[PDB]
Protein backbone atom coordinates (compact mmCIF):
# COMPACT_ATOMS: atom_id res chain seq x y z
CA UNK A 1 0.00 0.00 0.00
CA UNK A 2 2.86 2.44 0.66
CA UNK A 3 4.19 1.82 -2.86
CA UNK A 4 0.90 2.77 -4.52
CA UNK A 5 0.52 5.70 -2.11
CA UNK A 6 3.88 7.14 -3.15
CA UNK A 7 3.04 6.35 -6.78
CA UNK A 8 -0.19 8.36 -6.74
CA UNK A 9 1.62 11.10 -4.80
CA UNK A 10 4.28 11.35 -7.51
CA UNK A 11 1.54 11.34 -10.14
CA UNK A 12 -0.18 14.24 -8.37
CA UNK A 13 3.18 16.03 -8.23
CA UNK A 14 3.58 16.04 -12.03
CA UNK A 15 -0.20 16.08 -12.71
CA UNK A 16 -0.23 12.77 -14.60
CA UNK A 17 -3.98 12.29 -14.40
CA UNK A 18 -4.14 10.31 -17.67
CA UNK A 19 -2.73 7.27 -15.85
CA UNK A 20 -3.79 8.26 -12.33
CA UNK A 21 -7.46 7.88 -13.29
CA UNK A 22 -6.66 4.37 -14.56
CA UNK A 23 -4.60 3.37 -11.52
CA UNK A 24 -7.38 4.53 -9.19
CA UNK A 25 -10.04 2.45 -10.96
CA UNK A 26 -7.85 -0.66 -10.65
CA UNK A 27 -6.77 -2.68 -7.62
CA UNK A 28 -4.63 0.04 -6.05
CA UNK A 29 -5.10 -1.17 -2.44
CA UNK A 30 -3.35 2.00 -1.23
CA UNK A 31 -4.15 4.27 1.75
CA UNK A 32 -6.81 6.67 0.50
CA UNK A 33 -7.37 10.09 2.14
CA UNK A 34 -3.61 10.32 2.86
CA UNK A 35 -2.55 11.91 -0.43
CA UNK A 36 -5.72 14.02 -0.56
CA UNK A 37 -4.34 15.95 2.41
CA UNK A 38 -1.10 16.72 0.56
CA UNK A 39 -3.25 17.75 -2.42
CA UNK A 40 -4.36 20.95 -0.68
CA UNK A 41 -1.28 21.11 1.56
CA UNK A 42 1.02 21.36 -1.47
CA UNK A 43 -1.68 23.25 -3.46
CA UNK A 44 -2.15 20.52 -6.08
CA UNK A 45 -5.76 20.69 -7.21
CA UNK A 46 -7.62 18.74 -9.93
CA UNK A 47 -6.18 15.54 -8.41
CA UNK A 48 -8.11 15.07 -5.15
CA UNK A 49 -11.34 15.32 -7.16
CA UNK A 50 -10.84 11.92 -8.81
CA UNK A 51 -9.66 10.58 -5.44
CA UNK A 52 -12.83 11.61 -3.60
CA UNK A 53 -15.12 10.71 -6.52
CA UNK A 54 -14.68 6.92 -6.50
CA UNK A 55 -14.60 6.76 -2.68
CA UNK A 56 -17.75 8.84 -1.92
CA UNK A 57 -16.05 11.09 0.61
CA UNK A 58 -18.44 14.06 0.50
CA UNK A 59 -17.18 16.67 2.94
CA UNK A 60 -13.65 17.03 1.59
CA UNK A 61 -14.43 17.27 -2.13
CA UNK A 62 -15.96 20.69 -1.47
CA UNK A 63 -12.55 21.92 -0.29
CA UNK A 64 -11.29 21.30 -3.83
CA UNK A 65 -14.48 22.47 -5.57
CA UNK A 66 -14.15 25.85 -3.82
CA UNK A 67 -10.80 26.49 -5.52
CA UNK A 68 -11.96 24.79 -8.74
CA UNK A 69 -14.64 27.40 -9.48
CA UNK A 70 -17.79 25.31 -9.93
CA UNK A 71 -20.65 26.07 -7.55
CA UNK A 72 -23.39 23.66 -8.67
CA UNK A 73 -21.17 20.67 -7.88
CA UNK A 74 -20.30 22.27 -4.53
CA UNK A 75 -23.99 22.30 -3.56
CA UNK A 76 -24.48 18.79 -4.96
CA UNK A 77 -21.66 17.58 -2.72
CA UNK A 78 -22.79 19.55 0.32
CA UNK A 79 -26.32 18.13 0.12
CA UNK A 80 -24.71 14.67 0.25
CA UNK A 81 -22.23 15.53 3.03
CA UNK A 82 -24.64 17.43 5.32
CA UNK A 83 -21.75 18.68 7.45
CA UNK A 84 -21.54 22.18 8.90
CA UNK A 85 -17.99 22.87 7.72
CA UNK A 86 -18.82 21.86 4.14
CA UNK A 87 -21.88 24.13 4.00
CA UNK A 88 -19.90 27.00 5.53
CA UNK A 89 -17.09 26.62 2.99
CA UNK A 90 -19.58 26.45 0.11
CA UNK A 91 -21.29 29.61 1.38
CA UNK A 92 -17.96 31.42 1.75
CA UNK A 93 -17.00 30.41 -1.79
CA UNK A 94 -20.35 31.62 -3.15
CA UNK A 95 -19.89 34.92 -1.31
CA UNK A 96 -16.39 35.31 -2.76
CA UNK A 97 -17.66 34.55 -6.26
CA UNK A 98 -20.55 37.04 -5.99
CA UNK A 99 -23.03 34.15 -6.24
CA UNK A 100 -26.50 34.52 -4.73
CA UNK A 101 -28.75 31.90 -6.38
CA UNK A 102 -27.01 29.02 -4.60
CA UNK A 103 -25.86 31.10 -1.61
CA UNK A 104 -29.34 31.15 -0.06
CA UNK A 105 -29.83 27.45 -0.79
CA UNK A 106 -26.57 26.51 0.92
CA UNK A 107 -27.12 28.92 3.82
CA UNK A 108 -30.56 27.46 4.55
CA UNK A 109 -28.66 24.57 6.18
CA UNK A 110 -26.31 26.95 8.02
CA UNK A 111 -28.75 29.42 9.58
CA UNK A 112 -30.21 26.46 11.48
CA UNK A 113 -27.23 26.62 13.84
CA UNK A 114 -26.86 29.51 16.27
CA UNK A 115 -23.07 29.97 16.23
CA UNK A 116 -22.80 29.77 12.44
CA UNK A 117 -25.31 32.62 12.05
CA UNK A 118 -22.80 35.04 13.57
CA UNK A 119 -20.14 33.75 11.16
CA UNK A 120 -22.51 34.31 8.23
CA UNK A 121 -23.26 37.83 9.48
CA UNK A 122 -19.55 38.59 9.78
CA UNK A 123 -18.95 37.22 6.28
CA UNK A 124 -21.77 39.29 4.75
CA UNK A 125 -20.94 42.53 6.59
CA UNK A 126 -17.35 42.75 5.31
CA UNK A 127 -18.55 42.15 1.73
CA UNK A 128 -21.49 44.57 1.82
CA UNK A 129 -24.04 42.06 0.48
CA UNK A 130 -26.73 42.90 3.02
CA UNK A 131 -29.60 42.42 0.55
CA UNK A 132 -28.53 38.83 -0.10
CA UNK A 133 -28.34 38.17 3.65
CA UNK A 134 -31.83 39.63 4.12
CA UNK A 135 -33.24 37.51 1.28
CA UNK A 136 -31.56 34.41 2.73
CA UNK A 137 -32.91 35.06 6.24
CA UNK A 138 -36.40 35.74 4.86
CA UNK A 139 -36.73 32.02 4.06
CA UNK A 140 -35.98 31.12 7.69
CA UNK A 141 -39.72 30.98 8.40
CA UNK A 142 -40.10 28.05 6.01
CA UNK A 143 -37.95 25.70 8.09
CA UNK A 144 -38.42 22.98 10.71
CA UNK A 145 -35.61 23.73 13.20
CA UNK A 146 -35.65 27.52 13.60
CA UNK A 147 -34.67 28.95 16.99
CA UNK A 148 -34.69 32.31 18.76
CA UNK A 149 -31.36 33.64 17.51
CA UNK A 150 -32.38 33.52 13.84
CA UNK A 151 -35.44 35.75 14.25
CA UNK A 152 -33.50 37.88 16.75
CA UNK A 153 -30.78 38.67 14.21
CA UNK A 154 -33.46 39.13 11.53
CA UNK A 155 -35.22 41.76 13.67
CA UNK A 156 -31.85 43.39 14.41
CA UNK A 157 -31.05 43.65 10.70
CA UNK A 158 -34.54 45.02 10.06
CA UNK A 159 -34.03 47.65 12.77
CA UNK A 160 -30.61 48.49 11.28
CA UNK A 161 -30.98 48.00 7.50
CA UNK A 162 -34.69 48.01 6.52
CA UNK A 163 -36.63 50.27 8.91
CA UNK A 164 -39.69 50.21 6.62
CA UNK A 165 -40.30 46.49 7.32
CA UNK A 166 -39.18 46.10 10.95
CA UNK A 167 -42.57 46.99 12.45
CA UNK A 168 -44.43 43.94 11.14
CA UNK A 169 -41.71 41.45 12.08
CA UNK A 170 -41.34 43.05 15.51
CA UNK A 171 -45.09 42.93 16.20
CA UNK A 172 -45.26 39.33 14.92
CA UNK A 173 -42.21 37.71 16.58
CA UNK A 174 -42.04 39.86 19.73
CA UNK A 175 -42.45 36.86 22.04
CA UNK A 176 -40.03 34.55 20.22
CA UNK A 177 -37.00 36.87 20.17
CA UNK A 178 -34.97 37.57 23.29
CA UNK A 179 -35.39 40.71 25.40
CA UNK A 180 -31.86 42.15 25.84
CA UNK A 181 -30.35 41.51 22.40
CA UNK A 182 -33.17 43.41 20.67
CA UNK A 183 -33.51 46.22 23.21
CA UNK A 184 -29.78 46.96 23.03
CA UNK A 185 -29.90 47.19 19.23
CA UNK A 186 -33.00 49.41 19.37
CA UNK A 187 -31.31 51.70 21.90
CA UNK A 188 -28.21 51.86 19.69
CA UNK A 189 -30.54 52.81 16.82
CA UNK A 190 -32.25 55.38 19.11
CA UNK A 191 -35.73 54.45 17.85
CA UNK A 192 -38.00 55.70 20.63
CA UNK A 193 -41.22 54.89 18.74
CA UNK A 194 -40.80 51.14 19.40
CA UNK A 195 -38.82 51.06 22.67
CA UNK A 196 -41.94 51.95 24.69
CA UNK A 197 -43.97 49.24 22.94
CA UNK A 198 -41.23 46.66 23.56
CA UNK A 199 -40.99 47.66 27.23
CA UNK A 200 -44.77 47.35 27.58
CA UNK A 201 -44.69 43.92 25.92
CA UNK A 202 -42.05 42.69 28.39
CA UNK A 203 -43.64 44.58 31.33
CA UNK A 204 -40.70 46.98 31.62
CA UNK A 205 -42.86 49.85 32.83
CA UNK A 206 -39.96 51.78 34.37
CA UNK A 207 -37.93 52.04 31.16
CA UNK A 208 -41.20 52.69 29.32
CA UNK A 209 -42.22 55.69 31.44
CA UNK A 210 -38.63 56.96 31.38
CA UNK A 211 -38.61 56.85 27.58
CA UNK A 212 -42.06 58.46 27.37
CA UNK A 213 -40.99 61.29 29.67
CA UNK A 214 -37.71 61.80 27.80
CA UNK A 215 -39.40 61.56 24.37
CA UNK A 216 -43.10 62.52 24.50
CA UNK A 217 -43.22 63.53 20.82
CA UNK A 218 -44.55 60.26 19.37
Amino acid sequence: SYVETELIFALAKTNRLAELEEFINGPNNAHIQQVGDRCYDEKMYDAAKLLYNNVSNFGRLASTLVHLGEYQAAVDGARKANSTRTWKEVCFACVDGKEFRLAQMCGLHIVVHADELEELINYYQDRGYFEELITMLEAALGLERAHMGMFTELAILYSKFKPQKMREHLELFWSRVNIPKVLRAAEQAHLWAELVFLYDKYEEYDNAIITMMNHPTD
Binding site: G128, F130, A189, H190
Partner: peptide
Protein backbone atom coordinates in the same frame (compact mmCIF):
# COMPACT_ATOMS: atom_id res chain seq x y z
CA UNK B 1 -17.59 48.50 -1.11
CA UNK B 2 -17.29 49.47 2.57
CA UNK B 3 -20.88 50.65 2.98
CA UNK B 4 -20.34 51.21 6.73
CA UNK B 5 -19.70 54.90 6.01
CA UNK B 6 -23.18 55.64 4.67
CA UNK B 7 -24.60 53.07 7.12
CA UNK B 8 -23.46 55.27 10.01
CA UNK B 9 -23.83 58.69 8.35
CA UNK B 10 -27.46 58.38 7.25
CA UNK B 11 -28.59 57.02 10.62
CA UNK B 12 -26.69 59.68 12.57
CA UNK B 13 -28.09 62.46 10.38
CA UNK B 14 -31.64 61.14 10.77
CA UNK B 15 -31.20 60.90 14.54
CA UNK B 16 -29.76 64.42 14.79
Amino acid sequence: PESIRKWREEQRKRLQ
